[PDB]
Write a protein that binds this ligand. Sequence first.
Ligand code: MG
Ligand code: MG
Ligand code: MG
Ligand code: MG
Ligand code: MG
Ligand code: MG
Ligand code: MG
Ligand code: MG
Ligand code: MG
Ligand code: MG
Ligand code: MG
Ligand code: MG
Ligand code: MG
Ligand code: MG
Ligand code: MG
Ligand code: MG
Ligand code: MG
Ligand code: MG
Ligand code: MG
Ligand code: MG
Ligand code: MG
Ligand code: MG
Ligand code: MG
Ligand code: MG
Ligand code: MG
Ligand code: MG
Ligand code: MG
Ligand code: MG
Ligand code: MG
Ligand code: MG
Ligand code: MG
Ligand code: MG
Ligand code: MG
Ligand code: MG
Ligand code: MG
Ligand code: MG
Ligand code: MG
Ligand code: MG
Ligand code: MG
Ligand code: MG
Ligand code: MG
Ligand code: MG
Ligand code: MG
Ligand code: MG
Ligand code: MG
Ligand code: MG
Ligand code: MG
Ligand code: MG
Ligand code: MG
Ligand code: MG
Ligand code: MG
Ligand code: MG
Ligand code: MG
Ligand code: MG
Ligand code: MG
Ligand code: MG
Ligand code: MG
Ligand code: MG
Ligand code: MG
Ligand code: MG
Ligand code: MG
Ligand code: MG
Ligand code: MG
Ligand code: MG
Ligand code: MG
Ligand code: MG
Ligand code: MG
Ligand code: MG
Ligand code: MG
Ligand code: MG
Ligand code: MG
Ligand code: MG
Ligand code: MG
Ligand code: MG
Ligand code: MG
Ligand code: MG
Ligand code: MG
Ligand code: MG
Ligand code: MG
Ligand code: MG
Ligand code: MG
Ligand code: MG
Ligand code: MG
Ligand code: MG
Ligand code: MG
Ligand code: MG
Ligand code: MG
Ligand code: MG
Ligand code: MG
Ligand code: MG
Ligand code: MG
Ligand code: MG
Ligand code: MG
Ligand code: MG
Ligand code: MG
Ligand code: MG
Ligand code: MG
Ligand code: MG
Ligand code: MG
Ligand code: MG
Ligand code: MG
Ligand code: MG
Ligand code: MG
Ligand code: MG
Ligand code: MG
Ligand code: MG
Ligand code: MG
Ligand code: MG
Ligand code: MG
Ligand code: MG
Ligand code: MG
Ligand code: MG
Ligand code: MG
Ligand code: MG
Ligand code: MG
Ligand code: MG
Ligand code: MG
Ligand code: MG
Ligand code: MG
Ligand code: MG
Ligand code: MG
Ligand code: MG
Ligand code: MG
Ligand code: MG
Ligand code: MG
Ligand code: MG
Ligand code: MG
Ligand code: MG
Ligand code: MG
Ligand code: MG
Ligand code: MG
Ligand code: MG
Ligand code: MG
Ligand code: MG
Ligand code: MG
Ligand code: MG
Ligand code: MG
Ligand code: MG
Ligand code: MG
Ligand code: MG
Ligand code: MG
Ligand code: MG
Ligand code: MG
Ligand code: MG
Ligand code: MG
Ligand code: MG
Ligand code: MG
Ligand code: MG
Ligand code: MG
Ligand code: MG
Ligand code: MG
Ligand code: MG
Ligand code: MG
Ligand code: MG
Ligand code: MG
Ligand code: MG
Ligand code: MG
Ligand code: MG
Ligand code: MG
Ligand code: MG
Ligand code: MG
Ligand code: MG
Ligand code: MG
Ligand code: MG
Ligand code: MG
Ligand code: MG
Ligand code: MG
Ligand code: MG
Ligand code: MG
Ligand code: MG
Ligand code: MG
Ligand code: MG
Ligand code: MG
Ligand code: MG
Ligand code: MG
Ligand code: MG
Ligand code: MG
Ligand code: MG
Ligand code: MG
Ligand code: MG
Ligand code: MG
Ligand code: MG
Ligand code: MG
Ligand code: MG
Ligand code: MG
Ligand code: MG
Ligand code: MG
Ligand code: MG
Ligand code: MG
Ligand code: MG
Ligand code: MG
Ligand code: MG
Ligand code: MG
Ligand code: MG
Ligand code: MG
Ligand code: MG
Ligand code: MG
Ligand code: MG
Ligand code: MG
Ligand code: MG
Ligand code: MG
Ligand code: MG
Ligand code: MG
Ligand code: MG
Ligand code: MG
Ligand code: MG
Ligand code: MG
Ligand code: MG
Ligand code: MG
Ligand code: MG
Ligand code: MG
Ligand code: MG
Ligand code: MG
Ligand code: MG
Ligand code: MG
Ligand code: MG
Ligand code: MG
Ligand code: MG
Ligand code: MG
Ligand code: MG
Ligand code: MG
Ligand code: MG
Ligand code: MG
Ligand code: MG
Ligand code: MG
Ligand code: MG
Ligand code: MG
Ligand code: MG
Ligand code: MG
Ligand code: MG
Ligand code: MG
Ligand code: MG
Ligand code: MG
Ligand code: MG
Ligand code: MG
Ligand code: MG
Ligand code: MG
Ligand code: MG
Ligand code: MG
Ligand code: MG
Ligand code: MG
Ligand code: MG
Ligand code: MG
Ligand code: MG
Ligand code: MG
Ligand code: MG
Ligand code: MG
Ligand code: MG
Ligand code: MG
Ligand code: MG
Ligand code: MG
Ligand code: MG
Ligand code: MG
Ligand code: MG
Ligand code: MG
Ligand code: ZN
Lengths: 99, 83, 208, 99
Amino acid sequence: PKKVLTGVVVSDKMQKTVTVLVERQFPHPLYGKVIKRSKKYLAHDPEEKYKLGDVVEIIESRPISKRKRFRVLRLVESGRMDLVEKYLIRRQNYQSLSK
Amino acid sequence: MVKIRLARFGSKHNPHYRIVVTDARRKRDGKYIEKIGYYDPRKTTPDWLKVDVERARYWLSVGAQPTDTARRLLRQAGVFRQE
Amino acid sequence: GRYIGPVCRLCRREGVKLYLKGERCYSPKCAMERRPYPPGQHGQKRARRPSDYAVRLREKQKLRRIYGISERQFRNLFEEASKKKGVTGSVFLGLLESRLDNVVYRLGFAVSRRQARQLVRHGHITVNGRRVDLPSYRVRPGDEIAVAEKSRNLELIRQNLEAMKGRKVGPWLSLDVEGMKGKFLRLPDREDLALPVNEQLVIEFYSR
Amino acid sequence: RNLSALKRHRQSLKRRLRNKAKKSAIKTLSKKAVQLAQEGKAEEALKIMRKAESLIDKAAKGSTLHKNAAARRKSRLMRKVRQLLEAAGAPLIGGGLSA
RNA sequence: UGGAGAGUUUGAUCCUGGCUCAGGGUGAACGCUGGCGGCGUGCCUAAGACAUGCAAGUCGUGCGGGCCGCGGGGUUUUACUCCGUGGUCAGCGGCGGACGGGUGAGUAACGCGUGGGUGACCUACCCGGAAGAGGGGGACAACCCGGGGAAACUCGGGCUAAUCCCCCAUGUGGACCCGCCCCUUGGGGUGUGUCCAAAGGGCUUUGCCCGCUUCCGGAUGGGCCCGCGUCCCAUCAGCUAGUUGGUGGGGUAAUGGCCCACCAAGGCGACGACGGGUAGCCGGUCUGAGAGGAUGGCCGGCCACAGGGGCACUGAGACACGGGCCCCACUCCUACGGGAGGCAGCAGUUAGGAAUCUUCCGCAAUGGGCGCAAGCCUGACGGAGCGACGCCGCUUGGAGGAAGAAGCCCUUCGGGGUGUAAACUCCUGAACCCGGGACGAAACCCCCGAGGAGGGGACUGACGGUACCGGGGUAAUAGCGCCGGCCAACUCCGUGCCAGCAGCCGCGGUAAUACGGAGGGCGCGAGCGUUACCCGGAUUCACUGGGCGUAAAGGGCGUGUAGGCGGCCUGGGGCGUCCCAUGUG
RNA sequence: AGCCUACGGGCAGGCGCCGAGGGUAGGGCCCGUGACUGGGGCGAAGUCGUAACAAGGUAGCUGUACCGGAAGGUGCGGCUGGA
Ligand SMILES: [Mg+2]
Ligand SMILES: [Mg+2]
Ligand SMILES: [Mg+2]
Ligand SMILES: [Mg+2]
Ligand SMILES: [Mg+2]
Ligand SMILES: [Mg+2]
Ligand SMILES: [Mg+2]
Ligand SMILES: [Mg+2]
Ligand SMILES: [Mg+2]
Ligand SMILES: [Mg+2]
Ligand SMILES: [Mg+2]
Ligand SMILES: [Mg+2]
Ligand SMILES: [Mg+2]
Ligand SMILES: [Mg+2]
Ligand SMILES: [Mg+2]
Ligand SMILES: [Mg+2]
Ligand SMILES: [Mg+2]
Ligand SMILES: [Mg+2]
Ligand SMILES: [Mg+2]
Ligand SMILES: [Mg+2]
Ligand SMILES: [Mg+2]
Ligand SMILES: [Mg+2]
Ligand SMILES: [Mg+2]
Ligand SMILES: [Mg+2]
Ligand SMILES: [Mg+2]
Ligand SMILES: [Mg+2]
Ligand SMILES: [Mg+2]
Ligand SMILES: [Mg+2]
Ligand SMILES: [Mg+2]
Ligand SMILES: [Mg+2]
Ligand SMILES: [Mg+2]
Ligand SMILES: [Mg+2]
Ligand SMILES: [Mg+2]
Ligand SMILES: [Mg+2]
Ligand SMILES: [Mg+2]
Ligand SMILES: [Mg+2]
Ligand SMILES: [Mg+2]
Ligand SMILES: [Mg+2]
Ligand SMILES: [Mg+2]
Ligand SMILES: [Mg+2]
Ligand SMILES: [Mg+2]
Ligand SMILES: [Mg+2]
Ligand SMILES: [Mg+2]
Ligand SMILES: [Mg+2]
Ligand SMILES: [Mg+2]
Ligand SMILES: [Mg+2]
Ligand SMILES: [Mg+2]
Ligand SMILES: [Mg+2]
Ligand SMILES: [Mg+2]
Ligand SMILES: [Mg+2]
Ligand SMILES: [Mg+2]
Ligand SMILES: [Mg+2]
Ligand SMILES: [Mg+2]
Ligand SMILES: [Mg+2]
Ligand SMILES: [Mg+2]
Ligand SMILES: [Mg+2]
Ligand SMILES: [Mg+2]
Ligand SMILES: [Mg+2]
Ligand SMILES: [Mg+2]
Ligand SMILES: [Mg+2]
Ligand SMILES: [Mg+2]
Ligand SMILES: [Mg+2]
Ligand SMILES: [Mg+2]
Ligand SMILES: [Mg+2]
Ligand SMILES: [Mg+2]
Ligand SMILES: [Mg+2]
Ligand SMILES: [Mg+2]
Ligand SMILES: [Mg+2]
Ligand SMILES: [Mg+2]
Ligand SMILES: [Mg+2]
Ligand SMILES: [Mg+2]
Ligand SMILES: [Mg+2]
Ligand SMILES: [Mg+2]
Ligand SMILES: [Mg+2]
Ligand SMILES: [Mg+2]
Ligand SMILES: [Mg+2]
Ligand SMILES: [Mg+2]
Ligand SMILES: [Mg+2]
Ligand SMILES: [Mg+2]
Ligand SMILES: [Mg+2]
Ligand SMILES: [Mg+2]
Ligand SMILES: [Mg+2]
Ligand SMILES: [Mg+2]
Ligand SMILES: [Mg+2]
Ligand SMILES: [Mg+2]
Ligand SMILES: [Mg+2]
Ligand SMILES: [Mg+2]
Ligand SMILES: [Mg+2]
Ligand SMILES: [Mg+2]
Ligand SMILES: [Mg+2]
Ligand SMILES: [Mg+2]
Ligand SMILES: [Mg+2]
Ligand SMILES: [Mg+2]
Ligand SMILES: [Mg+2]
Ligand SMILES: [Mg+2]
Ligand SMILES: [Mg+2]
Ligand SMILES: [Mg+2]
Ligand SMILES: [Mg+2]
Ligand SMILES: [Mg+2]
Ligand SMILES: [Mg+2]
Ligand SMILES: [Mg+2]
Ligand SMILES: [Mg+2]
Ligand SMILES: [Mg+2]
Ligand SMILES: [Mg+2]
Ligand SMILES: [Mg+2]
Ligand SMILES: [Mg+2]
Ligand SMILES: [Mg+2]
Ligand SMILES: [Mg+2]
Ligand SMILES: [Mg+2]
Ligand SMILES: [Mg+2]
Ligand SMILES: [Mg+2]
Ligand SMILES: [Mg+2]
Ligand SMILES: [Mg+2]
Ligand SMILES: [Mg+2]
Ligand SMILES: [Mg+2]
Ligand SMILES: [Mg+2]
Ligand SMILES: [Mg+2]
Ligand SMILES: [Mg+2]
Ligand SMILES: [Mg+2]
Ligand SMILES: [Mg+2]
Ligand SMILES: [Mg+2]
Ligand SMILES: [Mg+2]
Ligand SMILES: [Mg+2]
Ligand SMILES: [Mg+2]
Ligand SMILES: [Mg+2]
Ligand SMILES: [Mg+2]
Ligand SMILES: [Mg+2]
Ligand SMILES: [Mg+2]
Ligand SMILES: [Mg+2]
Ligand SMILES: [Mg+2]
Ligand SMILES: [Mg+2]
Ligand SMILES: [Mg+2]
Ligand SMILES: [Mg+2]
Ligand SMILES: [Mg+2]
Ligand SMILES: [Mg+2]
Ligand SMILES: [Mg+2]
Ligand SMILES: [Mg+2]
Ligand SMILES: [Mg+2]
Ligand SMILES: [Mg+2]
Ligand SMILES: [Mg+2]
Ligand SMILES: [Mg+2]
Ligand SMILES: [Mg+2]
Ligand SMILES: [Mg+2]
Ligand SMILES: [Mg+2]
Ligand SMILES: [Mg+2]
Ligand SMILES: [Mg+2]
Ligand SMILES: [Mg+2]
Ligand SMILES: [Mg+2]
Ligand SMILES: [Mg+2]
Ligand SMILES: [Mg+2]
Ligand SMILES: [Mg+2]
Ligand SMILES: [Mg+2]
Ligand SMILES: [Mg+2]
Ligand SMILES: [Mg+2]
Ligand SMILES: [Mg+2]
Ligand SMILES: [Mg+2]
Ligand SMILES: [Mg+2]
Ligand SMILES: [Mg+2]
Ligand SMILES: [Mg+2]
Ligand SMILES: [Mg+2]
Ligand SMILES: [Mg+2]
Ligand SMILES: [Mg+2]
Ligand SMILES: [Mg+2]
Ligand SMILES: [Mg+2]
Ligand SMILES: [Mg+2]
Ligand SMILES: [Mg+2]
Ligand SMILES: [Mg+2]
Ligand SMILES: [Mg+2]
Ligand SMILES: [Mg+2]
Ligand SMILES: [Mg+2]
Ligand SMILES: [Mg+2]
Ligand SMILES: [Mg+2]
Ligand SMILES: [Mg+2]
Ligand SMILES: [Mg+2]
Ligand SMILES: [Mg+2]
Ligand SMILES: [Mg+2]
Ligand SMILES: [Mg+2]
Ligand SMILES: [Mg+2]
Ligand SMILES: [Mg+2]
Ligand SMILES: [Mg+2]
Ligand SMILES: [Mg+2]
Ligand SMILES: [Mg+2]
Ligand SMILES: [Mg+2]
Ligand SMILES: [Mg+2]
Ligand SMILES: [Mg+2]
Ligand SMILES: [Mg+2]
Ligand SMILES: [Mg+2]
Ligand SMILES: [Mg+2]
Ligand SMILES: [Mg+2]
Ligand SMILES: [Mg+2]
Ligand SMILES: [Mg+2]
Ligand SMILES: [Mg+2]
Ligand SMILES: [Mg+2]
Ligand SMILES: [Mg+2]
Ligand SMILES: [Mg+2]
Ligand SMILES: [Mg+2]
Ligand SMILES: [Mg+2]
Ligand SMILES: [Mg+2]
Ligand SMILES: [Mg+2]
Ligand SMILES: [Mg+2]
Ligand SMILES: [Mg+2]
Ligand SMILES: [Mg+2]
Ligand SMILES: [Mg+2]
Ligand SMILES: [Mg+2]
Ligand SMILES: [Mg+2]
Ligand SMILES: [Mg+2]
Ligand SMILES: [Mg+2]
Ligand SMILES: [Mg+2]
Ligand SMILES: [Mg+2]
Ligand SMILES: [Mg+2]
Ligand SMILES: [Mg+2]
Ligand SMILES: [Mg+2]
Ligand SMILES: [Mg+2]
Ligand SMILES: [Mg+2]
Ligand SMILES: [Mg+2]
Ligand SMILES: [Mg+2]
Ligand SMILES: [Mg+2]
Ligand SMILES: [Mg+2]
Ligand SMILES: [Mg+2]
Ligand SMILES: [Mg+2]
Ligand SMILES: [Mg+2]
Ligand SMILES: [Mg+2]
Ligand SMILES: [Mg+2]
Ligand SMILES: [Mg+2]
Ligand SMILES: [Mg+2]
Ligand SMILES: [Mg+2]
Ligand SMILES: [Mg+2]
Ligand SMILES: [Mg+2]
Ligand SMILES: [Mg+2]
Ligand SMILES: [Mg+2]
Ligand SMILES: [Mg+2]
Ligand SMILES: [Mg+2]
Ligand SMILES: [Mg+2]
Ligand SMILES: [Mg+2]
Ligand SMILES: [Mg+2]
Ligand SMILES: [Mg+2]
Ligand SMILES: [Mg+2]
Ligand SMILES: [Mg+2]
Ligand SMILES: [Mg+2]
Ligand SMILES: [Mg+2]
Ligand SMILES: [Mg+2]
Ligand SMILES: [Mg+2]
Ligand SMILES: [Mg+2]
Ligand SMILES: [Mg+2]
Ligand SMILES: [Mg+2]
Ligand SMILES: [Mg+2]
Ligand SMILES: [Mg+2]
Ligand SMILES: [Mg+2]
Ligand SMILES: [Mg+2]
Ligand SMILES: [Mg+2]
Ligand SMILES: [Mg+2]
Ligand SMILES: [Mg+2]
Ligand SMILES: [Mg+2]
Ligand SMILES: [Mg+2]
Ligand SMILES: [Mg+2]
Ligand SMILES: [Zn+2]
């Protein structure tokens, strides 16, 4: 109840807010192979104490804004830009797709 | 308010009511809060009636409401006899 | 509505003796023993090699003709015989001999499986002291399959039952020639039945 | 077709008037007070505030304004009157707000 | 506890490979045919248009009055009008009209499903608990007068009642600013100040009851939010100004860019954003060995809509199918100023279509609304009607009866076949006639008790003289498909690549078991076939369970990004994985 | 500036915001259709040659380029699925 999950911060540009990226894995319905999948969450940070590259725990909470519906609960471990880079690079490549 | 009443079942000409608590606004034969007993209006069998008086007491207390014919069946099932 | 019509032609087609009728089928012909070959203009021509289907078919129809029962009914049983755990082959036969009108024949009250149905519909029958006219009736074990009150005194009934005494019948059956009563001791059995039909053939036929 | 559902409609019209009339008095009285509050005259800016708080709860009895909405008004209402008079004045009248 | 394949590429073979068929299924329709009954089911198309009738009201125990009855009169007596009572018509007032009933248009969405959150919320009537009702005042319909209008309706003037509206008091308690305490999102407790209550009606009248006011709790219902699951196109690759977030405010029952001012410059996307296309979703349903595939009509749950499109009002609850307003289209009335209407409720009509029903009975039952109750209303519902449309039961007889009638068919002219088949004999007795005849119906209500528990007493059946029981009792419809191989079933004649058949392979050009008729046969049977659609077979999108040297298929070759995958040993964590219990399902 | 009023205020009315829809203009997608035209498929007989299957009577095929009524020919390089 009041779901809670862990993920890395990938954005802090917003006022009193951070974007958290959370992975999750599970067996493919027909092919079994444990496949990964993830999703960004806008979290409420009423002090911007949490910063880029921070791994955290966000909890289901009362609606703060249009997209914000989770407050950051606690810092899991600081500094992990390596993960942020993966997500940023994943983005970079999108440029190399259009026409 | 919440009611205790009979929802028809069984074939045509073969009625087989089912004592139950549901909201009055339900559609009779609709989705009910919980069954509390059955009652065959033709006694085609020995157990032509039955009630779980355990919970039936609970419902009447929390604020339930029987039909006047759900009254007959509960009374007969000895729900109001206290001693 | 059941069969109706030339039955001994069936005797001839399946090639086997089908004991449907009374006296005749024991006389010098169930139609047979005078025309052992099949009906039609041919029949007595060099017989043609039969397909797997021919076999599974006939062996199936032979069992159906035997009980002189409908295709819709016959089928609804086979499937019902599958749901039940226990050798579907033998079980299906089981549900067959439990069929009321048939009980009446195996209890000797009738000369034919067909005249058995007649006696039944016309209501000359009872089961635990209650008239019944539906040949379909599934006779449970331990049932007083007696002749009807009114029916007792009757040229046929008396005659059939009279002829019946002494003749011990049915390992799972109990004839009481006294009150013309009889009981379904229990569901029959694999070897308690004898019939010119490999039941496995019918199983294979209804696989398609 | 003469279904006397218009019995209800004729009523809803008589009703709508009482509701609107009740509510306008509130809004206007509420403003007439806060304007006196920001201005300075606490001697009566509060005198009017009581008249509001009452008039609110008044209609709050009826089918008009109801629920926590009665509070929501009285909240923001006397909330604003406090800060306005708080702009140099001190709670002159004992009425309304509690020191 | 469950798994079958065949035909067709060649002179022949093996393999590859497509096509086709046998199966099951249907809200079906069409052809031919058609006896009985029970339970079911029945506009899938034009969310096109609808004549008529019926579908939501009820309370005189909230209040005044109009009309009409019956009982009484009134003041010493009379005008009369007063009282009592019953009905009735509207009005004021209360509760219900948001349920129930219909439809799939729209919606690709927290819509739905599933599991959770709400310290961010509401909840009429019902139940439990705490406390309270003193006093005063007002208005508007009905009614009366006048006037406008064809009508619908409407303007002005004048009285009046109340559980309608309003002021004053008591404040159990509650609301709000502020402080403190505790807890931690707006949860709970407390102090000072301010603010808020109420309606009477009935009877067996000093007593009981229906009702009213405030607060807390419960039950039920519901709003909002979140994880995950939910269609085709990548020949849609980039998307975005309320756009993403912040502060303050607006609005709501409540969170939130839901709306607003100011600020910051962000939010989303190959894990498929944006765009286009299609679609109500589910429990379930159909198929399949299963894994899968397909599907959402009947029933139940949720949603959305009520000719199209907006909007708010009343209310606990609505943007409200049979309420209100505006615009658009259609219908109708008009005296041209103006006015009325909404079947996707039940029947029925019309258009469309291959195709989908009775303008029936009844509130007796169940359920719903209102009422102290009596009772009232209820096309919800319970029944009946029509349609082989589906499922199931069932009839057209049963036993005897010739080395075998007649007729027809074949013939090696000896005979063979239909064939125990028919006739005939006997036996039973669908239909029909007569008698009897329900269950469903005990509670509301009435006395005993106390108006409780308990006991006792009485009323009510549409279906229906129906089911069913008993007595009498007549032998009493049979079709349709197929017969070359798949594939059960063969001969005669006609026809001569003609007429025609055909699901694939193929048949017919004088000798056709394939065309047409006949005889016979096979298969089903009140049905049989046909067309359409879905799964199957199809192991042919292959996870289960396929392949790529020559049969369709390795990129012309490298480098490398994201992704996917990764050696031996020791320890920590316990996400995946696994076991148990429990909740839900 | 009308109405109500216990004079505190209310109603009506007015203005503005948004606003159904309508109008004008310009873009995007999709559908129907269009003289004429391009190739593709099928059909009793057709006309012209004979490129391919055997050295197919110049080994064939292929990418490309130019040329020719037509298959096709030839140049350059490639393949053997030719010797
Ligand atoms: Mg798991
Ligand atoms: Mg926001
Ligand atoms: Mg915010
Ligand atoms: Mg590039
Ligand atoms: Mg691209
Ligand atoms: Mg490009
Ligand atoms: Mg482009
Ligand atoms: Mg239920
Ligand atoms: Mg009753
Ligand atoms: Mg069938
Ligand atoms: Mg009898
Ligand atoms: Mg099978
Ligand atoms: Mg199979
Ligand atoms: Mg109306
Ligand atoms: Mg009325
Ligand atoms: Mg009303
Ligand atoms: Mg096993
Ligand atoms: Mg099986
Ligand atoms: Mg082929
Ligand atoms: Mg061929
Ligand atoms: Mg070939
Ligand atoms: Mg060949
Ligand atoms: Mg060849
Ligand atoms: Mg060859
Ligand atoms: Mg093949
Ligand atoms: Mg195919
Ligand atoms: Mg089929
Ligand atoms: Mg259908
Ligand atoms: Mg027809
Ligand atoms: Mg049914
Ligand atoms: Mg029917
Ligand atoms: Mg429709
Ligand atoms: Mg449909
Ligand atoms: Mg229509
Ligand atoms: Mg009616
Ligand atoms: Mg009504
Ligand atoms: Mg009505
Ligand atoms: Mg009178
Ligand atoms: Mg009178
Ligand atoms: Mg009189
Ligand atoms: Mg007189
Ligand atoms: Mg008088
Ligand atoms: Mg007079
Ligand atoms: Mg009177
Ligand atoms: Mg009245
Ligand atoms: Mg009223
Ligand atoms: Mg009330
Ligand atoms: Mg509804
Ligand atoms: Mg509905
Ligand atoms: Mg219905
Ligand atoms: Mg229904
Ligand atoms: Mg309808
Ligand atoms: Mg309908
Ligand atoms: Mg649909
Ligand atoms: Mg949702
Ligand atoms: Mg969602
Ligand atoms: Mg959800
Ligand atoms: Mg949920
Ligand atoms: Mg749940
Ligand atoms: Mg919830
Ligand atoms: Mg509540
Ligand atoms: Mg609740
Ligand atoms: Mg209510
Ligand atoms: Mg209470
Ligand atoms: Mg209290
Ligand atoms: Mg007034
Ligand atoms: Mg008036
Ligand atoms: Mg007057
Ligand atoms: Mg006139
Ligand atoms: Mg007046
Ligand atoms: Mg008055
Ligand atoms: Mg008065
Ligand atoms: Mg008064
Ligand atoms: Mg303290
Ligand atoms: Mg404390
Ligand atoms: Mg607090
Ligand atoms: Mg509280
Ligand atoms: Mg406080
Ligand atoms: Mg005061
Ligand atoms: Mg007061
Ligand atoms: Mg007195
Ligand atoms: Mg008293
Ligand atoms: Mg008394
Ligand atoms: Mg009362
Ligand atoms: Mg408490
Ligand atoms: Mg509690
Ligand atoms: Mg409550
Ligand atoms: Mg609700
Ligand atoms: Mg909830
Ligand atoms: Mg709500
Ligand atoms: Mg899921
Ligand atoms: Mg989703
Ligand atoms: Mg699905
Ligand atoms: Mg695509
Ligand atoms: Mg395209
Ligand atoms: Mg594009
Ligand atoms: Mg792009
Ligand atoms: Mg662009
Ligand atoms: Mg802006
Ligand atoms: Mg805010
Ligand atoms: Mg509210
Ligand atoms: Mg707020
Ligand atoms: Mg927005
Ligand atoms: Mg804000
Ligand atoms: Mg703004
Ligand atoms: Mg602005
Ligand atoms: Mg700012
Ligand atoms: Mg700045
Ligand atoms: Mg700036
Ligand atoms: Mg800026
Ligand atoms: Mg940018
Ligand atoms: Mg950007
Ligand atoms: Mg993603
Ligand atoms: Mg896409
Ligand atoms: Mg559909
Ligand atoms: Mg839809
Ligand atoms: Mg499913
Ligand atoms: Mg289906
Ligand atoms: Mg299965
Ligand atoms: Mg399945
Ligand atoms: Mg359908
Ligand atoms: Mg329908
Ligand atoms: Mg709409
Ligand atoms: Mg509309
Ligand atoms: Mg209400
Ligand atoms: Mg509303
Ligand atoms: Mg709506
Ligand atoms: Mg409505
Ligand atoms: Mg509306
Ligand atoms: Mg309607
Ligand atoms: Mg209304
Ligand atoms: Mg118009
Ligand atoms: Mg006209
Ligand atoms: Mg006219
Ligand atoms: Mg006219
Ligand atoms: Mg005129
Ligand atoms: Mg005129
Ligand atoms: Mg005018
Ligand atoms: Mg007009
Ligand atoms: Mg209709
Ligand atoms: Mg109508
Ligand atoms: Mg209808
Ligand atoms: Mg119709
Ligand atoms: Mg029609
Ligand atoms: Mg037509
Ligand atoms: Mg019907
Ligand atoms: Mg009832
Ligand atoms: Mg009732
Ligand atoms: Mg009484
Ligand atoms: Mg009455
Ligand atoms: Mg009525
Ligand atoms: Mg009726
Ligand atoms: Mg009905
Ligand atoms: Mg038919
Ligand atoms: Mg017909
Ligand atoms: Mg049948
Ligand atoms: Mg002889
Ligand atoms: Mg012969
Ligand atoms: Mg002969
Ligand atoms: Mg003959
Ligand atoms: Mg011959
Ligand atoms: Mg001859
Ligand atoms: Mg011979
Ligand atoms: Mg002869
Ligand atoms: Mg004769
Ligand atoms: Mg005899
Ligand atoms: Mg005779
Ligand atoms: Mg008899
Ligand atoms: Mg009869
Ligand atoms: Mg009779
Ligand atoms: Mg009688
Ligand atoms: Mg009762
Ligand atoms: Mg009683
Ligand atoms: Mg009743
Ligand atoms: Mg009642
Ligand atoms: Mg008494
Ligand atoms: Mg009494
Ligand atoms: Mg009692
Ligand atoms: Mg009767
Ligand atoms: Mg009757
Ligand atoms: Mg009679
Ligand atoms: Mg006779
Ligand atoms: Mg006959
Ligand atoms: Mg006969
Ligand atoms: Mg066939
Ligand atoms: Mg054949
Ligand atoms: Mg054939
Ligand atoms: Mg065949
Ligand atoms: Mg065939
Ligand atoms: Mg000809
Ligand atoms: Mg000829
Ligand atoms: Mg010939
Ligand atoms: Mg030939
Ligand atoms: Mg032929
Ligand atoms: Mg024939
Ligand atoms: Mg069939
Ligand atoms: Mg068919
Ligand atoms: Mg389809
Ligand atoms: Mg298929
Ligand atoms: Mg296959
Ligand atoms: Mg195939
Ligand atoms: Mg394939
Ligand atoms: Mg295959
Ligand atoms: Mg796969
Ligand atoms: Mg393969
Ligand atoms: Mg190749
Ligand atoms: Mg290669
Ligand atoms: Mg290649
Ligand atoms: Mg290549
Ligand atoms: Mg390339
Ligand atoms: Mg690189
Ligand atoms: Mg790269
Ligand atoms: Mg990697
Ligand atoms: Mg490893
Ligand atoms: Mg790894
Ligand atoms: Mg080691
Ligand atoms: Mg290791
Ligand atoms: Mg170590
Ligand atoms: Mg390890
Ligand atoms: Mg774990
Ligand atoms: Mg364990
Ligand atoms: Mg377990
Ligand atoms: Mg479990
Ligand atoms: Mg459980
Ligand atoms: Mg469990
Ligand atoms: Mg269960
Ligand atoms: Mg003054
Ligand atoms: Mg606005
Ligand atoms: Mg604007
Ligand atoms: Mg527009
Ligand atoms: Mg516009
Ligand atoms: Mg426009
Ligand atoms: Mg222009
Ligand atoms: Mg289009
Ligand atoms: Mg064009
Ligand atoms: Mg062109
Ligand atoms: Mg052309
Ligand atoms: Mg073609
Ligand atoms: Mg052609
Ligand atoms: Mg050459
Ligand atoms: Mg040559
Ligand atoms: Mg040459
Ligand atoms: Mg050369
Ligand atoms: Mg060569
Ligand atoms: Mg070339
Ligand atoms: Mg090429
Ligand atoms: Mg030339
Ligand atoms: Mg040319
Ligand atoms: Mg040249
Ligand atoms: Mg070369
Ligand atoms: Mg090379
Ligand atoms: Mg080379
Ligand atoms: Mg070479
Ligand atoms: Mg060669
Ligand atoms: Mg060589
Ligand atoms: Zn025989």
